[PDB]
Ligand binder design. Sequence first.
Ligand SMILES: CCN1C(=O)C(C)(C)c2cc3[nH]c4c(c3cc21)CCCc1c(C)n[nH]c1-4
Length: 247
Amino acid sequence: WALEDFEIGRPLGKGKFGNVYLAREKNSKFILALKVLFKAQLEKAGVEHQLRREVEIQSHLRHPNILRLYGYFHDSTRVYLILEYAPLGTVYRELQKLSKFDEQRTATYITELANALSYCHSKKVIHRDIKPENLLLGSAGELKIADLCGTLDYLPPEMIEGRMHDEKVDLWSLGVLCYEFLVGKPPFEANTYQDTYKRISRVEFTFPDFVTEGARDLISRLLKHNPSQRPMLREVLEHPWITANSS
Ligand SMILES: CCN1C(=O)C(C)(C)c2cc3[nH]c4c(c3cc21)CCCc1c(C)n[nH]c1-4
């Protein structure tokens, strides 16, 4: 496998370490996403080992709601990842267009993620980053997972406090996402870092008017301070509000 076996098209996204391009395999005309990473930049951050780790993991994961890694190769100055192309773009963009999602769309997305994360947890893969910009949309509008300054909200209390940490972190993330989907902003975001940390640490947030009793119930359960009191992914799937609203 090599670069000349691919027709490179338009860029789809610009990361720190490198770009991702829309492309077709020359022989078959199989549409795909080609992620290019510059080796020198990877070596400057000291993440070449964490990159090899993601790649090993993603290649062994096959779920319809996890972005598939078909392969990889490298030349002198670059690393190439042959990836599934999600034709409909990022959830981030969808959310910026619609402002917030209704309950049917949200429950359906959360269902897809609960399944995605169950698969992961079952393969001892934990903490997959599920903030909107890391969620793509496949051919059927189905969502796909694809894993200081950032959004602290998504980090659970036990991680920001450097306590012991579990699979239960994905449940917290899921509750944050569910809120962001319905409301259009995440629940703990503040004017400063200190205020955000405080809000997370104490789970201080409020619901806007329009959020229904069922949505509040689910989000409240996912955003429990004690990781042990957070529900299981199965209990999320079987939640009245999810089953009532999901496709
Ligand atoms: C530039 C905005 N945009 C669009 O208008 C459409 C809908 C064409 C679109 C599809 C897309 N797919 C994917 C991306 C993307 C972006 C956009 C972002 C890069 C990561 C990636 C991977 C790893 N796979 N697919 C995708």
